[PDB]
């Protein structure tokens, strides 16, 4: 007979079996080539939905940017970023009138988070865009390259450990024209050999000077790198994700600090937390809308979504918000939050890599950079891409594209959500002064709305009042991907809701397996993922001892460590049996080297070796009790018990895991493609230094537990300790005070080297 499984929704309700319609089992779509065609199809789409603002021209930039807000009102259902400043302020002047005193309260923690934060808060995160090398360097090396730009510039003024003078000089860096950056290029030498009398070559790296301008640094200071959103699910196309620059996120950390602090004091943004508080907030307001549930009301919910949510923002009304939610605040504080919506409203996206061309005659390929797109024989392109260049060939400045309207992904959330919930604030009945009233929630772009009114004519008059309210601020709800129905059935970032009881089925299971960080610490996080998702993401009992049963089956395939009772063969089987026949504790031996699987769903929270400890005979764990451990390299507190495992709710999330230090917690291999780049000199200089920076960090005890923040000059820094190491050993100690004089003698001998 003909078999289809999608007919079992004829019996099971759709929100109870909705996980069958999540193809999260196959691979996600990847972008293959670039994002150059994807960035230009967003700089076009931003300047199409905002096409009627006045085209200014920036003074220090040369950018022909668009100034789209408080322009002509939209007069169709096509989305439009023409936001009304006298309604952005107005719809969140009603944010304080519902929840009183939010803004000056929430600034006051933000005025204290600004007064205790180092620069180290911005060196953690995603890979960023440095401006020195014009490339996605990761978040440490981009920060620790731009700082010695200032040191190789005249004015450092930043080395005081706090980031606000680091956020003073990034404004001041836009004053010094000659920005003498560092360039290193690769050369060769010629040495001899005395043993074999042969004369061979040797590789080394040179040094080169380079300078900038004020129409060349300011672009690179305001440059967003545009990647492609790899491994997004649920979209046939792709999209550009934006990587903010190095200077930008310093100001942006304070802006989302404030803006997250708003949403934790509000109660309709599920975003500042994880998914479990979101299920509370979701099912909160379905009951909050049964507060005024009269004898005859009609309450239709809206399973909303916002289409083109990122292009139809504008950081010019972000500046309108954070000028208003910092009312009567100090002058320095209102200023420092204000730089980030300024340098998003002059931001200049790069155009990615470029395009790969193909000869159908000479059988040759090549690829141009994205910068050559200002000057190309336009018949090199097919008919679709040729349309995309001509609509933004006026916008190419210095290989970038001036994109002042619109945000885009990977840059900033949680303040446009504050905007998006403030319209949902306005449906509170004290503000409507009519029979219809609404409330709901607002995620990043997927919202859910519940409106009520005493007949269908009221709801119809209540839905569009909301829709024409969101049009005043550039929030354009997806008329494709949204619908209305009565209460009890909606979704909200795929948290489906059936009459009261949510089925999660969002970030379903991309992992459930060996997410190899180590060999033990991906079992300790392995059995934690089955543990945590019995709580958070709601998998039941039998699938928890299936996702454990199979977790081990590919824990033993990646790490080859099958049992001895399986007589199958791999790189070792024989000396495992030495552990089998000698240890009287057969069934307590550890499983990262061929043991039984004592785990079940009574004991996931127990770690691996602390589970298998009250059974082992003294030899094995005593062979594991060796604290020398050439296989550990005892980490730092930010990296002790931290793996970066991505959900589908956010860009990244670190989650911890009870991992005992053991010989199986080793660090995996560094990638070696940097050895063949012409960027070798960023490694051979710096590979020698964490050999010896941690030789200093032996001499402080708390340096491997706390950040050491003192004077500069690491060589001068330990000798200040060495002479206070000296006297408390001199006044009292076990060692002789003549060997003290040897400790004395080294100190000036350091200074005898100038």
């Amino acid at each position: 007979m003909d078999v289809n499984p999608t007919l079992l929704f004829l019996k099971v309700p759709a929100q109870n079996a909705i996980s069958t319609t999540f193809p999260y089992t196959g691979d996600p779509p990847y972008s293959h080539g670039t994002g150059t065609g994807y960035t230009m199809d967003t700089v076009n789409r931003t300047h199409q939905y905002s096409e009627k603002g006045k085209w200014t021209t920036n003074t220090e930039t040369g950018a022909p940017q668009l100034n789209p807000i408080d322009g002509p009102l939209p007069e169709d259902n096509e989305p439009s970023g023409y936001a009304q400043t006298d309604c952005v302020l107005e719809a969140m002047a009603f944010l304080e009138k519902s929840h009183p005193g939010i803004f000056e309260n929430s600034c006051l923690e933000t005025m204290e988070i600004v007064q205790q934060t180092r620069v180290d808060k911005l060196t953690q995160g995603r890979q960023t865009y440095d401006w020195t090398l014009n490339r996605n360097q990761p978040a440490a090396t981009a920060l620790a390259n731009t700082i010695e730009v200032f040191r190789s510039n005249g004015l450092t003024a930043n080395e005081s450990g706090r980031l606000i003078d680091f956020l003073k000089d990034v404004m001041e860096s836009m004053d010094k024209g000659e920005m003498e950056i560092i360039t290193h290029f690769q050369r060769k030498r010629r040495v001899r050999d005395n043993m074999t009398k042969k004369m061979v070559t040797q590789r080394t790296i040179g040094k080169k000077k380079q300078r900038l301008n004020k129409r060349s640094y300011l672009i690179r200071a305001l440059t967003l790198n545009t990647m492609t959103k790899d491994a997004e699910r649920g979209k046939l196309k792709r999209r550009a994700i934006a990587t903010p620059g190095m200077q930008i996120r310093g100001f942006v950390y304070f802006v989302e600090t404030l803006a997250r602090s708003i949403c934790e004091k509000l109660e309709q943004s599920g975003l500042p937390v994880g998914g479990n508080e979101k299920k509370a907030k979701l099912a909160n307001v379905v009951r909050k809308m049964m507060t005024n549930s009269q004898d005859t009301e009609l309450s239709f919910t809206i399973t909303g979504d916002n289409t083109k949510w990122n292009e139809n923002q504008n950081p010019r009304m972000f500046l309108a918000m954070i000028t208003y939610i910092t009312r009567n605040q100090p002058e320095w504080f209102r200023n420092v939050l204000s730089i980030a919506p300024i340098m998003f409203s002059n931001k200049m996206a790069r155009l990615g890599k470029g395009y790969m061309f193909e000869s159908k005659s000479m059988k040759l390929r090549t690829q141009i950079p994205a910068e050559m797109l200002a000057s190309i024989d336009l018949k090199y392109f097919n008919e679709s891409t040729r349309k995309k260049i001509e609509k933004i060939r006026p916008l190419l400045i210095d290989g970038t594209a001036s994109l002042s309207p619109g945000m885009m992904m990977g840059m900033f959330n949680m303040l446009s959500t504050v905007l998006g919930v403030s319209i949902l604030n306005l449906g509170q009945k004290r503000y409507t002064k009519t029979t219809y009233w609404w409330d709901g929630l607002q995620s990043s772009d997927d919202f859910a709305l519940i409106v009520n009114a005493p007949n269908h004519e009221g709801i119809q008059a209540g839905v569009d009042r909301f829709y024409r309210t969101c049009k005043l601020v550039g929030i354009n709800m997806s008329k494709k991907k949204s619908y209305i129905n009565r209460t009890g059935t909606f979704e909200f970032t795929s948290f489906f809701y059936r009459y009261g009881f949510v089925a999660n089925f969002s970030m379903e299971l991309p992992s459930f397996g060996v997410s190899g960080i180590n060999e033990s610490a991906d079992m300790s996080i392995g059995v934690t993922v089955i543990k945590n998702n019995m709580i958070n993401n709601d998998l039941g009992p039998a699938t928890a001892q299936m996702a454990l049963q199979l977790f081990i089956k590919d824990y033993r395939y990646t790490y080859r460590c099958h049992r001895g009772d399986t007589q199958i063969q791999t790189r070792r089987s024989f000396e495992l049996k030495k552990l089998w026949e000698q240890t009287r504790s057969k069934a307590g031996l550890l499983v990262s080297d061929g043991g039984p699987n004592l785990y079940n769903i009574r004991n996931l929270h127990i770690p691996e070796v602390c589970l298998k400890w009250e059974l082992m005979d003294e030899d094995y764990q005593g062979r594991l009790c060796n604290p020398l451990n050439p296989f550990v390299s005892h980490k730092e507190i930010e990296s002790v018990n931290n793996a970066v495992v991505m959900p589908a709710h956010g860009p990244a999330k670190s989650m911890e895991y009870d991992a005992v230090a053991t010989t199986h917690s080793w660090i995996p291999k560094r990638n070696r493609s940097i050895l063949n780049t012409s960027q070798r000199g960023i490694l051979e200089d710096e590979q020698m230094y964490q050999k010896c920076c941690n030789l200093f960090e032996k001499f402080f005890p708390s340096s491997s537990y706390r950040r050491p923040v003192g004077i500069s000059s690491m060589v001068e820094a330990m000798v200040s300790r060495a002479r206070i190491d000296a006297r408390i050993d001199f006044e009292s100690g076990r060692i002789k005070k003549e060997e003290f004089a040897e400790i004395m003698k080294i100190c000036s001998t350091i200074e005898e080297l100038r």
């Binding site: 620069v119 180290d120 990761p138 090396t141 620790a144 080395e159 450990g161 790899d230 479990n276 508080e277 509370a280 507060t291 549930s293 009459y499 009261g500 060996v514 997410s515 190899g516 960080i517 709580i535 039941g540 928890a544 790490y559 790189r571 070792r572 000396e575 495992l576 080297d593 127990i606 400890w613 005593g622 020398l628 296989f631 005892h634 990296s639 002790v640 793996a643 005992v660 080793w666 995996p668 291999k669 560094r670 070696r672 940097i674 960023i682 490694l683 590979q687 964490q690 010896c692 920076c693 005890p701 537990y705 050491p708 500069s712 000059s713 060589v715 820094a717 080294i746 001998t749 350091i750």
Partner: protein, 683 residues
């Protein structure tokens, strides 16, 4: 000593080590995570990719000193290349094979003391005991609940402060030293590190880990305690709960606080229930608190709580000799008086028949928020030394003092009538009516009291009618102390008597404790409060009360139908339908039960209107005691949160929705069970 030479030996090399001279405080603070190699976007592929390389693992250069490159088998177990980015070399997993079968064997018996918290969990589990499955639905509550805070409840930075001392003391930088309680606990931890081994620094920041009070929002269907929070998945679920009692020391301080909250969910259940004199005894035999039942905990507990002592005195146990009024502990230190039954006219000329205490009496007013000494005369307050945490606690202590002194200034300060007729058929008392009025608003009471000058001698200041302290003038008789009121009193236990109305009477007949004295604070549980009946459905929520009640009728319908036909009074006095009657309108009290019991009596006499729709629909209403009413009893109003959402007499409703073709019951949306086809068929 010898470390410092190589700190110098590198320097006479090139300027490689002499940019490390230039490296800032900040630059070493940043280059400690300097990664030329980025964080892996997909580490799950890289582990599946690199484990097929012959050398996936980077092990540091000591392996070349201590591990052979030749084993007995035939494979080469390390490599002579360097890693990119270190002096670390690359090895195979046959190195880790070699070390765990042929490596050094060190016997540190205090390695359990390093990871002590994890071995506490094994101790909790191996010595823990399971209970059988209680098949109940999940109504989970999603609250920020603590995970493993540990000792002394110390602040998260202050947790790192005591760790910073014991790792090495010269890096503390603590402007605030410590409190007195931290001065002993760090001395014990001080010698324990030498007791471990010659120890790494990692033994220090695991002691840090048992002090971090992590509070993570989790759906907690059950108890929320740092002994039950680590399991949290073993216990709770879909059709089911798993009763789980982990081993270890059941605590002493707040099993009281575990028992208080479980008590109040039985007293408030009883006040809606038809028989508090039987049901609270009956629910003592089924409720378990962490496996240990309520019957076992109450006996060894000398903690005085209002609902707990009702649970004590129901079973035949004593209470103290301290009378309560407005939920405060009042101790008679001196004085005596007699009762006198007198009527007073209030400001609304309302007669309140009060018990006049004719005699000078000196009391100690101790509250949850205040501590005070009341000097009380016949219809008069003599003197009141009063303390409390804030001025709103002083507001409660004076208002309870101004009512009980029974003065004519308080009586003529009443503005309006008093109808705090509480949720019940009986009535109330004029003492408790006079509390709530001025606990709502007593500004006119504060002005009618009398204002006198005072003398501030030993920090004994006064208080003004606008609830402000003043050293110059104050309200008459009330002095507010800057220090705490000395109490130090203990009270002997006396056998006391109790009624059906939960009115706790002494040997003389003075009513000590009452459901009006029950405080309205509903705390956060700790030990899983597990009821064996259906009295968890209100904890679940008002919505669930309506759902699970019509659920329970369906499965046990053949129990109900015979109890429908034969003994409806046993059917009505079920305690599971008493969950419904907490939601019943009080204006419609007994009015609904009046009609349903007759509408059933209509259906028993006609023998042919056996319908199965309305029998399901109205049976929870007749659990209330019925009353005579007029003919208008047909707008059946059922409370959910705030709004009284109605059910109709005929057909369906949004609240109660029945579909005949589907034969499935929709109750405020949710589908409740499936009734069998037989009571549709017959008559």
């Amino acid at each position: 000593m010898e470390r410092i030479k190589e700190l110098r030996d590198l320097m006479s090399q090139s300027r490689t080590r002499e940019i490390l001279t230039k490296t800032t405080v900040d630059h070493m603070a940043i280059i400690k995570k300097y990664t030329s190699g980025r964080q892996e976007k997909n580490p799950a592929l890289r582990m599946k990719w690199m484990m097929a390389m012959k050398y996936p693992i980077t092990a540091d250069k000591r392996i070349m000193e201590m591990i052979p490159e030749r084993n007995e088998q035939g494979q080469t177990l390390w490599s002579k290349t360097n890693d990119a980015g270190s002096d670390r070399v690359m090895v195979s997993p046959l190195a880790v094979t070699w070390w765990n079968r042929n490596g050094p064997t060190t016997s540190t018996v205090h390695y359990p003391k390093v990871y002590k918290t994890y071995f506490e969990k094994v101790e909790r589990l191996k010595h823990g005991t399971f209970g059988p499955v209680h098949f109940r639905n999940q109504v989970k509550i999603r609250r920020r609940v603590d995970i493993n805070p540990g000792h002394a409840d110390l602040s998260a930075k202050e947790a790192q402060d005591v760790i910073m001392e014991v790792v090495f003391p010269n890096e503390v930088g603590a402007r605030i030293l410590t409190s007195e309680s931290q001065l002993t606990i760090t001395k014990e931890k001080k010698e324990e590190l030498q007791d471990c081994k010659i120890a790494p620094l990692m033994v220090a920041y695991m002691l840090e880990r048992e002090l971090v009070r992590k509070t993570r929002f989790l759906p907690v269907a059950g108890g929320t305690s740092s002994v039950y929070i680590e399991v949290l998945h073993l216990t709770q679920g879909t059709c089911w709960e798993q009763m789980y009692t982990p081993g270890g020391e059941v605590r002493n301080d707040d099993v009281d606080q575990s028992l208080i909250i479980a008590a109040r969910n039985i007293v408030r259940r009883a006040t809606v229930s038809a028989d508090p004199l039987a049901s609270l005894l009956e629910m003592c035999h089924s409720t378990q608190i962490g496996g240990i039942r309520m019957v076992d905990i109450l006996r060894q507990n000398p903690t005085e709580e209002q609902a707990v002592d009702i649970c004590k005195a129901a079973m035949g146990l004593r209470i103290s000799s301290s009378f309560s009024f407005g939920g405060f502990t009042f101790k008679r230190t001196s004085g005596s008086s007699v009762k006198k039954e007198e009527e007073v006219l209030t400001g609304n000329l309302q007669t309140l028949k009060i018990r006049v205490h004719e005699g000078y009496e000196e009391f100690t007013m101790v509250g949850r928020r205040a501590t005070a000494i009341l000097r009380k005369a016949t219809r008069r307050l003599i003197q009141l030394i009063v303390s409390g945490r804030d001025e709103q606690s002083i507001a409660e202590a004076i208002i309870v003092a101004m009512v009980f002194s029974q003065e004519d200034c308080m009586i003529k300060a009443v503005r309006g009538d008093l109808n705090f007729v509480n949720r019940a058929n009986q009535r109330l008392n004029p003492m408790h009516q006079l509390l709530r009025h001025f606990q709502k608003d007593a500004k006119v009471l504060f002005q009618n009291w009398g204002i006198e000058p005072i003398d501030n001698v030993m920090g004994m200041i006064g208080i003004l009618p606008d609830m402000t302290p003043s050293a110059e003038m104050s309200l008459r008789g009330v002095r507010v102390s800057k220090m705490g009121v000395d109490e130090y009193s203990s009270t002997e236990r006396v056998v006391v008597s109790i009624d059906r109305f939960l009115r706790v009477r002494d040997q003389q007949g003075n009513v000590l404790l009452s459901p009006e004295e029950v405080s309205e604070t509903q705390g956060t549980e700790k030990l899983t409060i597990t009821y064996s009946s259906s009295m968890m459905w209100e904890i679940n929520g008002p919505e669930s009360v309506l759902v699970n009640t019509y659920q329970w009728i369906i499965r046990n319908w053949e129990t109900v139908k015979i109890q429908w036909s034969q003994d409806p009074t046993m059917l009505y006095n079920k305690m599971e339908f008493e969950s419904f009657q907490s939601l019943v309108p009080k204006a419609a009290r007994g009015q609904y039960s009046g009609f349903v019991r007759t509408l059933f009596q209509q259906m028993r006499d006609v023998l042919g209107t056996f319908d199965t729709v309305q029998i399901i629909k109205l049976l929870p209403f007749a659990a209330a005691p019925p009353e005579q009413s007029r003919m208008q009893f047909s707008s059946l109003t059922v409370n959910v949160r705030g709004s009284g959402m109605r059910i109709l007499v005929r057909g369906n409703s949004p609240v109660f929705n029945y579909n005949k073709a589907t034969k499935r019951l929709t109750v405020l949306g949710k589908d409740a069970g499936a009734l069998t086809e037989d009571p549709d068929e017959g008559t």
